[PDB]
Design a protein around this nucleic acid. Structure first.
Lengths: 49, 57
RNA sequence: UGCCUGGUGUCUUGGGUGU
């Protein structure tokens, strides 16, 4: 490489936010009883606002 | 407006009772379901109406 | 001939995430 590279060990930490705990998709599913709109929440297979 | 908004209609003499779709009940657990707030308020209103009718006669 | 199942509270509160 034409440019030299800064290089060495550094202390890194893994945070709790992982993509597989955030990915969510919905085509159709449960709806609220009062308004008949998609429910809220990824855990409940909800929709996006 | 004579046809649509008559002044004496601002005093309630008959109350419309909404269908259960407006005040749905919720099953709190597997056995006991919960009455909605509007249902309880309508029950209180109807009890007061019955009380007035009974007292008057 | 022994023949297969979709149906998911609510209200508060707290702590967080990206701007």
């Amino acid at each position: 490489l034409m440019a030299q590279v800064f290089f060495g060990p550094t202390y890194y930490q893994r945070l709790r936010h992982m993509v597989d705990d955030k990915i969510h998709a919905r085509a159709r599913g449960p709806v609220q009883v009062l308004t008949r709109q998609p429910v809220e929440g990824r855990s409940r297979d909800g929709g996006l606002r | 407006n004579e046809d649509y908004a008559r002044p004496e209609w601002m005093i309630i003499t008959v109350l419309p009772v909404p269908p259960p779709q407006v005040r749905p009940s919720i099953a709190m657990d597997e056995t006991t379901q919960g009455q909605d707030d509007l249902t309880h308020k309508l029950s209180d209103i109807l009890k007061a109406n019955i009380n007035v009718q009974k007292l008057e006669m």
